[PDB]
C-alpha cells in the first residue's frame, strides 16, 4: 500500500508546513506538521486547557467510536524556554493521504506551550524520527511510519517541500517524475534517533567548493538551516551589511540586498540553495533589517538541516534495516 499527501506552508515565509491527518471513526481531520526531529505524535485536544487553545481544530476521543484509552499512559515532550506540551494517550485509527494505521498512539495534549497556542493553524505534530525518541510513558510507543511500515510497498517515505508552494509526502513509493537526475544516498547514524547523516561540505555562491564534514539531521520540523559558525560566517562575509545581532539572535542583513546561493554536498553530488530561499523578511513590520536563513548551530549543539536546505531537493527517507537518506535535485 501507499500513501500521498499535500503538504502547505502556513504563512508567506514557509516558516512550516501543514498535512491533513485523518484520525478516528468517523474521520476527523487535523493539520499536523510532519516532523522529522522528533518521535511523538501528538494533537490539541477536547482535554487541552480551553484557555490554551486559539484557533485550532482539536481531536475529541470521546466521538470516535475506534478510540481506546491507553490507561496509565502519559507523554512529556520539552522545549526551549522550560515550556513543555504534556498529556495522555489514546491509541486510534489515522490515516495520511490514503494510507490506514490502525492502533496508532495519538498522544492528547492536555497542556501546551505559549508558542504552540500562538499558532492557531498547527494542530498538532507527526512525528518521523525513529522510534526510540517517543516520550509515552511507561511504554514507548511507535512511530505512525513504524506501524505503517510492514504495509508499504517500500519502506520509504520522500518529503518534496515546495517553496511559497505546496509540497507533497508520499508513503511507501518514490515518484520518478519529482526529481531530476539521480538519487544520491548517503549513510544514516541513528545512534541519537535522528535521520543524522555527514554532508560532504560546503559552497558561497560560485565560490570553491570546500571539503569538510559536516555531521547533521535532516529535520522538517525546523524551519532555518543550522551550520558550524565557520561556514555560517563564510556565507554572510559575503553579503554586504550583513552582520550578527545579539538583540535579534542572529545574523541580519539589509532587506535590499540579494543573497548568494549555498550548495552543500551529498557524497559526491550537490544541492543547490537558491539565495532567495535563504531570505525570511524583515525582523520587524516596516525594518530594512532583514533575518538570515542559515544561523550558527554553536548554541544548539547540533547542526540542523532543516526546511531551508530540504525545500531545494527531493528528500528521500529510506527505513530499511539499514536506513539512508536520498537527495535529488529537482
Known amino acids: 500500500s501507499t500513501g500521498s499527501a499535500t503538504t502547505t506552508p502556513i504563512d508567506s515565509l514557509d516558516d512550516a508546513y501543514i498535512t ?25 485536544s477536547s482535554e487541552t486547557t480551553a484557555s490554551e487553545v486559539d484557533g485550532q481544530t482539536i481531536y475529541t476521543p470521546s466521538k470516535s467510536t475506534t478510540a481506546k484509552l491507553l490507561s496509565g499512559a502519559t507523554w512529556s515532550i520539552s522545549y526551549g524556554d522550560g515550556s513543555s506540551s504534556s498529556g495522555d494517550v489514546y491509541t486510534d485509527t489515522v490515516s495520511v493521504g490514503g494510507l490506514t494505521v490502525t ?11 505559549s508558542s504552540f497556542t500562538e499558532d492557531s493553524t498547527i494542530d498538532g505534530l507527526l512525528g518521523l524520527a525513529f522510534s526510540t525518541l517517543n516520550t509515552v510513558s511507561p511504554t514507548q510507543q511507535k512511530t505512525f511510519f513504524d506501524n505503517a511500515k510492514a504495509s508499504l510497498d517500500s519502506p520509504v517515505f520522500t518529503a518534496d517541500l515546495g517553496y511559497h508552494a505546496p509540497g507533497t509526502y508520499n508513503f511507501g513509493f518514490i515518484d520518478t517524475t519529482a526529481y531530476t537526475g539521480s538519487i544520491t544516498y548517503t549513510a544514516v547514524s541513528t545512534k541519537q534517533g535522528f535521520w543524522e547523516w555527514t554532508s560532504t561540505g560546503y559552497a558561497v555562491g560560485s565560490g570553491t567548493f570546500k571539503s569538510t564534514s559536516i555531521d547533521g539531521i535532516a529535520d522538517t520540523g525546523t524551519t532555518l538551516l543550522y551550520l558550524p559558525a565557520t561556514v555560517v560566517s563564510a556565507y554572510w562575509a559575503q553579503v554586504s551589511g550583513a552582520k550578527s545581532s545579539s538583540s535579534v539572535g542572529g545574523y541580519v542583513f539589509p532587506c535590499s540586498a540579494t543573497l548568494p546561493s549555498f550548495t552543500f554536498g551529498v557524497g559526491s553530488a550537490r544541492i543547490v540553495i537558491p539565495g532567495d530561499y535563504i531570505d525570511f523578511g524583515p525582523i520587524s513590520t516596516g525594518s530594512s533589517s532583514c533575518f538570515g536563513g542559515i544561523q550558527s548551530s554553536a548554541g544548539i ?13 527531493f528528500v528521500v527517507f529510506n527505513g530499511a534495516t539499514t536506513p539512508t537518506l536520498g537527495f535529488a535535485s529537482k
Open 20 to 44: 491533513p491527518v485523518q484520525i478516528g471513526t468517523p474521520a476527523q481531520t487535523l493539520n499536523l506538521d510532519f516532523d522529522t526531529g522528533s518521535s511523538d505524535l501528538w494533537v490539541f
Open 301 to 313: 549543539g547540533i547542526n540542523i538541516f532543516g526546511d531551508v536546505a530540504l525545500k531545494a531537493a
Open 103 to 113: 492502533g496508532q498512539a495519538v498522544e492528547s495534549a492536555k497542556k501546551v506551550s
